[PDB]
């Protein structure tokens, strides 16, 4: 492992992936608004496709792993980038409703998953000892890029039209393909289903319990951002532009990603899991103490803490997987962990909204968002004892 | 050399290049017409950029060769395809006059040259004994694809608009990039200018005289198609749709490409050059006997012969270069031959038009188009004597 050098170049490519994928998805809602402007001059489906894209990313990793194991990081990443580019291109072309849904959701999500998992796998390939620092740098850069995307996307959208926006996103995907072409391998590479789906990583019950804890904790991850924005917009009004929450969340999340990437490098072994546990607990608390402040003063601090803990957890995830299962079978571990997190991630916000509708208040929604992090914290705390 | 097998796959990729490049250029005029439709609702520059693109292709081969020698066929071809894709993309975006000229001409032509020369070089890499057959197949397929392009291009253009057309051409270029990624190498790979521009191939005076003859002959290549169409449209009117000439030219050119690719495989050595000489002479005659028939009956036959000879010469070119200079330095020979042909090719049609304007009749234009082929025939006839 070079521990740097050309690895840094790979890191750049890795960044250009998270950033792009996740930024083109954080902007999905904006696109729909533009579609509404084009819906006239001649139903509630935006959320369905918006969640379908990310859900497809997560659901298709259990398989992207099969490939990256067999084919390799470069081939899988390039194929995913190509599929994403074609999805965006065909979305630009077609002017319809069902075909747009199929194209965007299926093609873009599948390509995004294929281009996303090999990035983490190759990052592990190169450093293997400073993996914490590399993951922190990648997370911080990707966060900055993803935040930056909506501004330009909305300005272009207000400028001309939707198809041009899809063209711009497609060229972004093309540049991602070109960069992903740099994942130079550095490590050795009826019964067909039994060899493609060996599920050998699911032995070593420490990984099993770790994955269970992460999956349980992910059930309350996507609530306290979208629901927090909708709740501050609806309740806690009479405030000026309410942008402080978003900006502080982003800044502290980036700083926490960098800091956690750096510090995780120091802890010897499975003690790294403790870094998650702590953060997990905080997350839960930082949710349960969101609606207890009558003024925005407490909201600023709670949002700062929320973003810091989010960055901690996000950047910490992958190095722990590589330490747990080793480098040879880290791709399978990452893929199956993402697949397991797939369902709670999409099931969280819907449950929060359903509870809000049933009770009419966001209190229960935020409490139920905060509890699963604590449950996962307990499970992960028990993990390293063996 | 496999003499086939995976080489055939490469052949397919090779086809997808000529076809695309040359088809997107044969359609350039159509695009300008569409621009004229968009010029209203709010000068004579079409020919300048249309010729600039092809001229840039030819002018930049003397260098593309340097690269393909040093970097390799795959890297150079992929870079050229990427530059072409970005050129088409930015042409789709910008709505102006000077920026469109710069983008299309410079970017598209440079990318086209970069993606074009390595195709021939790799075709030589793989077969090396059936190179005649491979070149014939490539030429026939590329001719069919290039003649097919204008129909779809014009139908889409009449459908919606120009930017969508540029998007479609850009995705064509992207597919060309993906295919060009298959050029797997099979052969070993103040003073900086003296090593990058060694010009070692320009020894072995047989190659020198061959290149001189080809350059002289190319001076009268592009006249008897564009000027022939304009002359049949202007003079020889009262005829139904005048499509017989074009269709017969294309069909016989494809058939001749295939047949010459096959037969050239049989001639042992430098005797292959004779195949050019013969065809060259015919070309000249087939020009000088264009305006001597008062009815279209002779025109059909003369066009058939013209297309047959054109296919002969086009498909024959490269195998002779590989036989002459060998496989190691065939890339430099091809690149410098293309660079030398660059100037007469662009200087021919302008001289034909100038003579037509000065005299007012196409007779002198066609005579001067036919003579240079005969001069080149004489030179190439003298070539193999040594
Ligand atoms: C302003 C202008 C800017 C210009 C832009 C910049 C241009 C310069 C950059 C050019 C790029 C750099 C050159 C690239 C070099 C590439 C060579 C290389 O590195 O190796 C190639 C790489 C690896 O080659 P390799 O050489 O390294 O292989 C290593 C093995 N040894 C060591 C033996 C050589 O090739 C690949 O493996 C990539 C395969 C990816 C396959 C993708 C195809 C998937 C298709 C999916 C289907 C999509 C269709 C969807 C269907 C939809 C249906 C509706
Ligand atoms: N807030 C994020 C959303 C987001 C959150 C989580 I947990 C995700 O799963 C990860 C993340 C990092 C890893 O190293 C691994 I292994 C899995 C993903 I993929 C996305 C965003 O939208 O950018
Ligand atoms: N009629 C063609 C025009 C065209 C004619 C000639 I001569 C060209 O130079 C070649 C051709 C084949 C070779 O093997 C070599 I080496 C050089 C090119 I490039 C294009 C078309 O427009 O398709």
Swiss-Prot record, chains A, B:
Changing residue 310 to A: Does not affect localization to the cell membrane. Abolishes T3 uptake activity. Changing residue 380 to P: In MCT8 deficiency; does not affect homodimerization activity. One of its GO terms (molecular function) is identical protein binding. Changing residue 53 to T: In MCT8 deficiency; impaired homodimerization. Changing residue 349 to L: In MCT8 deficiency; impaired thyroid hormone transporter activity; does not affect localization to the cell membrane. Changing residue 25 to Q: Does not alter kinetic characteristics of thyroid hormone (TH) transport. Changing residue 27 to F: In MCT8 deficiency; impaired homodimerization. Keywords: Acetylation, Cell membrane, Disease variant, Membrane, Transmembrane, Transmembrane helix, Transport. The chain crosses the membrane at residues 4-24, 47-67, 75-95, 104-124, 133-153, 162-182, 209-229, 243-263, 273-293, 296-316, 334-354, 364-384. Residues 25-46, 96-103, 154-161, 230-242, 294-295, 355-363 are extracellular. Changing residue 376 to R: In MCT8 deficiency; loss of thyroid hormone transport. It is found in: Cell membrane; Apical cell membrane. Residues 68-74, 125-132, 183-208, 264-272, 317-333 are cytoplasmic. Highly expressed in liver and heart. In adult brain tissue expression is largely confined to endothelial cells of the blood-brain barrier (at protein level). One of its GO terms (biological process) is amino acid metabolic process. GO terms for cellular component: apical plasma membrane; plasma membrane. It catalyses: 3,3',5-triiodo-L-thyronine(out) = 3,3',5-triiodo-L-thyronine(in); L-thyroxine(out) = L-thyroxine(in); 3,3',5'-triiodo-L-thyronine(out) = 3,3',5'-triiodo-L-thyronine(in); 3,3'-diiodo-L-thyronine(out) = 3,3'-diiodo-L-thyronine(in). Belongs to the major facilitator superfamily. Monocarboxylate porter (TC 2.A.1.13) family. Specific thyroid hormone transmembrane transporter, that mediates both uptake and efflux of thyroid hormones across the cell membrane independently of pH or a Na(+) gradient. Major substrates are the iodothyronines T3 and T4 and to a lesser extent rT3 and 3,3-diiodothyronine (3,3'-T2). Acts as an important mediator of thyroid hormone transport, especially T3, through the blood-brain barrier. Monomer. Homodimer. Homooligomer. It is linked to Monocarboxylate transporter 8 deficiency: Consists of a severe form of X-linked psychomotor retardation combined with abnormal thyroid hormone (TH) levels. Thyroid hormone deficiency can be caused by defects of hormone synthesis and action, but it has also been linked to a defect in cellular hormone transport. Abnormal brain development associated with MCT8 deficiency may be the consequence of either decreased or increased intracellular T3 concentrations. This is Monocarboxylate transporter 8. It comes from Homo sapiens. The chain holds residues 94 to 500 of 539 of the full protein.
């Amino acid at each position: 492992p070079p521990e740097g050098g050309f690895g840094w170049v790979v890191v750049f490519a890795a960044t250009w992936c998270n950033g792009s994928i996740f930024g083109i998805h954080n902007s999905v809602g904006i696109l729909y608004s533009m579609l509404l402007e084009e819906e006239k001059e001649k139903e509630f489906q935006a959320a369905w496709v918006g969640a379908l894209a990310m859900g497809m990313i997560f659901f298709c990793s259990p398989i992207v792993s099969i490939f990256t194991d067999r084919l390799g990081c470069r081939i899988t990443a390039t194929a995913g980038a190509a599929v994403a580019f074609i999805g965006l291109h065909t979305s630009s072309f077609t002017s319809s409703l069902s075909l747009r849904y199929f194209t965007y959701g299926i093609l873009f999500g599948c390509g995004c998953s294929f281009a996303f998992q090999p990035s983490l796998v190759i990052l592990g390939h190169y450093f293997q000892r400073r993996l914490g620092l590399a993951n922190g740098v990648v997370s911080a850069g990707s966060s900055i890029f993803s935040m930056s995307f909506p501004f330009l996307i909305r300005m272009l959208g207000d400028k001309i039209k939707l198809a041009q926006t899809f063209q711009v996103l497609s060229t972004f995907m093309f540049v991602l393909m070109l960069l992903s072409l740099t994942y130079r391998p550095l490590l050795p590479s009826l019964a067909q289903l039994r060899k493609y789906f060996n599920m050998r990583v699911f032995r070593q019950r420490t990984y099993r319990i770790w994955a269970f804890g992460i999956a349980a904790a992910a059930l309350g991850y996507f609530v306290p951002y979208v629901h927090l924005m909708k709740y501050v917009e609806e309740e806690f009004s009479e405030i000026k532009e309410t942008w402080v929450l978003l900006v502080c969340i982003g800044a502290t999340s980036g700083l926490g990603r960098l800091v956690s990437g750096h510090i995780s490098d120091s802890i010897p072994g499975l003690k790294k899991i403790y870094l998650q546990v702590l953060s997990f607990l905080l997350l839960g608390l930082m949710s349960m103490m969101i609606p207890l402040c009558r003024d925005f003063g407490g909201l600023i601090v709670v949002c700062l803490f929320l973003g810091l803990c989010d960055g901690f957890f996000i950047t910490i995830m992958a190095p722990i997987a590589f330490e747990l299962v080793g480098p040879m079978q880290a791709s399978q571990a990452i893929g199956y962990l993402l697949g397991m997190m797939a369902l709670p991630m999409i099931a969280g916000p819907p449950i929060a909204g359903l509870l809000r509708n049933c009770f009419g208040d966001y209190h229960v929604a935020f409490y139920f968002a905060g509890v699963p992090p604590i449950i996962g914290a307990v499970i992960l705390f028990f993990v390293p004892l063996m």
